[PDB]
Write a protein that binds this ligand. Structure first.
Ligand SMILES: Cc1cc2nc3c(=O)[nH]c(=O)nc-3n(C[C@H](O)[C@H](O)[C@H](O)COP(=O)(O)O)c2cc1C
Ligand SMILES: Cc1cc2nc3c(=O)[nH]c(=O)nc-3n(C[C@H](O)[C@H](O)[C@H](O)COP(=O)(O)O)c2cc1C
Ligand SMILES: Cc1cc2nc3c(=O)[nH]c(=O)nc-3n(C[C@H](O)[C@H](O)[C@H](O)COP(=O)(O)O)c2cc1C
Lengths: 206, 202
C-alpha cells in the first residue's frame, strides 16, 4: 500500500454537497495552511500541443480568484505556447500528509500587462536577473554565459523591468474534483461541473 | 530543499536517460523521499482538453514506466482514443522534478492478472465493486457490497476492466533547483538510433 498520509482531513462537503465549489477549495487550502502541509499550492499543470499531446510541469498557484486559480510563467515557454493555441488545461494538487487531491480543469486566459507588472514587482527582486536573461524552455547553449550575464544584472540589488514575455494566466474553472482517502478504501470523490446557471455536483465511484 | 540533491548528470550528459531515471528513483528510495512514485498523469480527450490525477508508478520497464488503473475510468477512456500522455514526479525534499512524455498502451490480460494478484488482498473488494469514475448513486450500498466481499479469504478474481498500461517514453526531463536560480534542466528526446540530449533554459 502506497499512501502514507496520517493527518485527519475533515471532508463534510462529501456529505453536504455545497452548491458553490470555490468555497470547498477555500476550506481545503485554509486547512492545509493551518496544519502545515508542505507546499500545498504546487500544481502539476497539464497543457496540450496542437495534436492533443499533453505536457506537464509544476507551477505555483499565486492567487485564488472568483473564477479559478492564477499562476505566472513565460509566454515563450512550452506551456505558454501550448496555452496560446489551446487554452484548455488541467492541474492536480496532492497533499501526502492528509491523502487529499484537488483536480482543477478549465481554460487559461492571459491577464493584462498591468497585472503582470504587479505580479513581477511582487516577486522578490533576487528572482529578477535570471528570469530576465532566460528564455524559458529554449535550448541552453552555454551555462556559464547565462550565469555570468545574470550576475551582472544582479549587481543592481533592486527591481528590474518586467521582461516582455513574463505573463500571468487565470485558469477559469469548468470542473473540479476534491478527492479524500475515505474509510475502507471508499475514496471520497466530489465532482463539480459548470452548468448554465451555477454548478452540478456529483459523487464519483473510487 | 531539505535533503541533499546531487545532479551530476547535468554536467556529464549520460547517453541513456533510462539509466538516469533508474538512478534518480533508487536515490529517492535511499534518502527517504516521501511517496516518490506518485505521478501526476495527464491524458486528453478528443478535443485536446487535458485531465489529470495521481497514479503510482508500479515498475520501470525497458521502454518506460508502468501503472495500473480501470479501463472505464476517465483516463482509460481518454487513452483508448488518444494514447499520448505526460506525467510529472515532484520531490519537495530535494527540489527535483522528472517529466515523462510518451504513449501509454494497454498490456495483455496475463500481465493484469499478475498485477492484480500482487496487490494486498484488502484492496480487492472495493476495486471489484466500484466502476471507477462513473457516478456514485448510493454510497452506503457500495460500502455494504464491498464489506460482503471483505469477509472472504485470499485473492478475488481480477475484475473486468482492471488493466495495466506501459507509458512508452519519447522524451524525459530531469529538473533540479541548481545554483543562483539557474535551474538545471536536462532534456532527452528519442531518435531513430537512440536518444538526443540537451540542456534547457530555466
Ligand atoms: C516563473 C516562475 C518560476 C518559479 N520557479 C520556482 C522554482 O523553480 N522552484 C520553486 O521552489 N518555486 C518556484 N516558483 C514559485 C515561487 O517560488 C513562489 O512560490 C510563487 O511564485 C509565489 O509565491 P508566494 O505566493 O507563496 O509568495 C516560481 C515561480 C515563477 C513565477
Ligand atoms: C516547486 C516548483 C515551482 C515552480 N513554479 C513555477 C511557476 O510558478 N511558474 C513557472 O513558469 N515555472 C515554475 N516552475 C518551473 C516549471 O516546473 C518548468 O520547469 C518551467 O515553467 C518550464 O515548463 P515548460 O517547459 O513545460 O513550459 C516551478 C518548478 C518547481 C520545481
Ligand atoms: C496517492 C494516490 C495514488 C493513486 N494511485 C492510483 C493508481 O495507481 N491507479 C488508479 O487507477 N488510481 C489511483 N489513484 C486514484 C486516482 O487519482 C483517480 O482518482 C482515479 O484513478 C480516477 O481517475 P480518472 O477519473 O481521472 O480516470 C491514486 C490516488 C492517490 C491520491
Amino acid at each position: 500500500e502506497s499512501l502514507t498520509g496520517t493527518l485527519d482531513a475533515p471532508f463534510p462537503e462529501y456529505q453536504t454537497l455545497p452548491a458553490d465549489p470555490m468555497s470547498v477549495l477555500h476550506n481545503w487550502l485554509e486547512r492545509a495552511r493551518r496544519v502545515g502541509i508542505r507546499e500545498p499550492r504546487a500544481l502539476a499543470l497539464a497543457t496540450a500541443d496542437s495534436q492533443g499531446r499533453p505536457s506537464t510541469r509544476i507551477v505555483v498557484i499565486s492567487e485564488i480568484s472568483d473564477a479559478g486559480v492564477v499562476f505566472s510563467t513565460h509566454a515563450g515557454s512550452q506551456k505558454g505556447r501550448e496555452l496560446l493555441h489551446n487554452p484548455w488545461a488541467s492541474g492536480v494538487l496532492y497533499w501526502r500528509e492528509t491523502s487529499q487531491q484537488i483536480i482543477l480543469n478549465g481554460q487559461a486566459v492571459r491577464l493584462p500587462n498591468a497585472k503582470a507588472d504587479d505580479a513581477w514587482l511582487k516577486r522578490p527582486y533576487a528572482t529578477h536577473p535570471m528570469s530576465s536573461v532566460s528564455r524559458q524552455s529554449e535550448e541552453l547553449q552555454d551555462v556559464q554565459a547565462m550565469r555570468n550575464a545574470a550576475r551582472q544584472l544582479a549587481e543592481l540589488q533592486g527591481p528590474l523591468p518586467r521582461p516582455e514575455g513574463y505573463c500571468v494566466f487565470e485558469l477559469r474553472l469548468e470542473s473540479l474534483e476534491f478527492w479524500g482517502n475515505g474509510q475502507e478504501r471508499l475514496h471520497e470523490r466530489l465532482r463539480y461541473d459548470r452548468s448554465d446557471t451555477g454548478w452540478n455536483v456529483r459523487r464519483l465511484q473510487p
